[PDB]
């Protein structure tokens, strides 16, 4: 889907989550949830907080 810019670093804290670093360009897999968005970063998909990423449309 779209691409999102990681605005902060975020280390996963749950098994469905994924870790990212600030500046990371991630692929937006699912944005139906207002709080968690499923993204793809270096081979891993999973959720991160929606407020920590930004859409590049």
Short mmCIF file of C-alpha atoms in Angstrom, two decimals:
data_model
loop_
_atom_site.label_atom_id
_atom_site.label_comp_id
_atom_site.label_asym_id
_atom_site.label_seq_id
_atom_site.Cartn_x
_atom_site.Cartn_y
_atom_site.Cartn_z
CA UNK A 1 0.00 0.00 0.00
CA UNK A 2 1.32 3.48 0.97
CA UNK A 3 4.60 4.41 2.61
CA UNK A 4 4.89 5.86 6.10
CA UNK A 5 7.65 7.76 7.83
CA UNK A 6 8.59 6.55 11.31
CA UNK A 7 8.56 9.72 13.46
CA UNK A 8 10.04 8.06 16.57
CA UNK A 9 11.86 4.85 17.42
CA UNK A 10 9.65 2.11 18.74
CA UNK A 11 10.68 -1.28 20.07
CA UNK A 12 8.01 -4.01 20.01
CA UNK A 13 6.38 -4.79 23.35
CA UNK A 14 3.92 -7.53 22.31
CA UNK A 15 4.12 -10.50 19.97
CA UNK A 16 1.97 -8.89 17.26
CA UNK A 17 4.19 -5.83 17.20
CA UNK A 18 7.24 -4.82 15.16
CA UNK A 19 10.31 -2.58 15.98
CA UNK A 20 11.25 0.54 13.99
CA UNK A 21 13.69 3.42 14.13
CA UNK A 22 12.91 7.08 13.58
CA UNK A 23 13.34 8.04 9.91
CA UNK A 24 12.39 4.50 8.74
CA UNK A 25 10.29 4.26 5.63
CA UNK A 26 7.73 1.56 6.17
CA UNK A 27 5.12 -0.01 3.92
CA UNK A 28 1.56 0.48 5.27
CA UNK A 29 -0.17 -2.87 5.38
CA UNK A 30 -3.33 -2.03 7.36
CA UNK A 31 -4.67 1.25 8.66
CA UNK A 32 -8.25 0.32 9.68
CA UNK A 33 -7.40 0.72 13.41
CA UNK A 34 -7.09 4.21 14.89
CA UNK A 35 -4.43 3.25 17.33
CA UNK A 36 -2.27 0.55 15.73
CA UNK A 37 -1.28 0.31 12.04
CA UNK A 38 0.27 -2.85 10.56
CA UNK A 39 3.51 -2.01 8.73
CA UNK A 40 6.42 -3.71 7.06
CA UNK A 41 10.06 -2.91 8.05
CA UNK A 42 13.10 -5.11 7.11
CA UNK A 43 11.31 -8.43 6.60
CA UNK A 44 8.99 -8.14 9.58
CA UNK A 45 5.35 -7.05 9.60
CA UNK A 46 3.37 -6.25 12.70
CA UNK A 47 1.84 -3.32 14.54
CA UNK A 48 3.23 -0.07 15.83
CA UNK A 49 1.38 2.93 17.21
CA UNK A 50 -0.37 4.93 14.45
CA UNK A 51 0.73 8.20 16.10
CA UNK A 52 4.36 7.32 15.77
CA UNK A 53 4.21 7.03 11.95
CA UNK A 54 3.26 9.50 9.19
CA UNK A 55 1.67 8.81 5.78
CA UNK A 56 3.49 9.78 2.56
CA UNK A 57 0.53 9.76 0.12
#
